[PDB]
């Protein structure tokens, strides 16, 4: 039972940090890309973190 | 329309810029295209063309739209629609020359 | 025949009023945008001013900020130009260019300043 808990919160912990990854962007924060570029390089990125 | 030799980089879906932004906007799914010749023997005068304008004040524009109105803008006391402080004329013209 | 006559030119000292004038028959004038044209000696030929349709909508040169003052006769299609706070270099011969088709510009008047 522990170890399907402490699994299900691996996994949970996991997609969360995978949530702040570039993936290869400019930032991991889609307002500061936003905030920074133009809207076809923008959108660019945004597909890419998508 | 008219335009200038650097004003043909504005005219593009996507571009960034004074002119691509206040007086003609290109929709990012834009289908369609751009044929731009030189107009030297047309367009051009010996001391100075100025019947092509451009706007060059405006607080945007989405796109393909017309905005014939040419009202005074304000920069931020009010001028009340007249010439003066805090607000300038929104149109420029380009003054082309041989 | 689309013509051309001039009125108003010669001999002024510097601080004088009065008017200049174009005078064309034969077509309207609210159909486009007329143009002012002015020569000096020098490397090309200088403008001025402009007025536009839907309004007058009148344009200066940066050199000439606010001293031209232009009244407008409407009924009979007649141009009025009114000179304020004159300085010399501008001593010049102006004509009026309209455009119906054909480039067109007439004879032009003089003007000095002493």
Known sequence: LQDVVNQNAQALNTLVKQLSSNFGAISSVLNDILSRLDPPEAEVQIDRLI | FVIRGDEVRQIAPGQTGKIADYNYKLPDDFTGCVIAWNSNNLDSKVGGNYNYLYRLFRKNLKPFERDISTEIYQAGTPCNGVEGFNCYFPLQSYGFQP | ?114
């Open chain 3, 1 to 114: 025949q689309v013509q051309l006559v001039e009125s108003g030119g010669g001999l002024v000292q510097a601080g004088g009023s009065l008017r200049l004038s174009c005078a064309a028959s034969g077509f309207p004038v609210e159909s486009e945008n007329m143009h002012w044209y002015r020569q000096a000696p020098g490397k090309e030929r200088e403008w001025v001013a402009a007025i536009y349709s839907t309004g007058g909508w009148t344009l200066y040169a940066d050199s000439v900020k606010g001293r031209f003052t232009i009244s407008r006769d409407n009924a009979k299609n007649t141009v009025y130009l009114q000179m304020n706070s004159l300085k010399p270099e501008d001593t010049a011969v102006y004509y009026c260019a309209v455009q119906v088709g054909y480039w067109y510009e007439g004879q032009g008047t003089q003007v000095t300043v002493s």
